């Protein structure tokens, strides 16, 4: 019933809807990080600088989440 940790967003604390990855190699939900960077003014969870224009959509993980959604919504 639990959600796999690799699909969890550090911010929303739940399943990622569209995974983006930072140059540092960190993975967030696209919309969860967008609003969070607005609330803190381009600062991440650890207080370090981060802009939304510096992340890309992690494609392979996005594909993996879609597959997970199939097996989850099956139950
Ligand atoms: Cl992966």
UniProtKB/Swiss-Prot annotation:
Q: Where, subcellularly, is it found?
A: Secreted; Host cell
List residues of the U-box domain: 2-75
Record's comment on post-translational modification: Ubiquitinated in the presence of host E1 ubiquitin-activating enzyme, E2 ubiquitin-conjugating enzyme and ubiquitin.
Summarize the protein's role: Effector proteins function to alter host cell physiology and promote bacterial survival in host tissues. This protein is an E3 ubiquitin ligase that interferes with host's ubiquitination pathway.
What is recorded about the protein's domains? U-box 1 is critical to the ubiquitin ligase activity, and U-box 2 mediates interaction with host target.
Protein name in UniProt: E3 ubiquitin-protein ligase LubX
The lineage, from the top, is:
Bacteria, Pseudomonadati, Pseudomonadota, Gammaproteobacteria, Legionellales
The stretch of the full-length protein covered here is 124 to 198 of 240
């Amino acid at each position: 019933t639990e959600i796999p940790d690799i699909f969890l967003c550090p911010i929303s604390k739940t399943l990622i809807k569209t995974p983006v990855i930072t140059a540092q190699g960190k993975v967030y939900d696209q919309e969860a990080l967008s609003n969070f960077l607005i609330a803190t003014g381009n600062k991440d969870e650890t207080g370090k600088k981060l802009s939304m224009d510096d992340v890309v959509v992690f494609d392979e993980l996005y594909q993996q989440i879609k597959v997970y959604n199939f097996y989850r919504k099956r139950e």
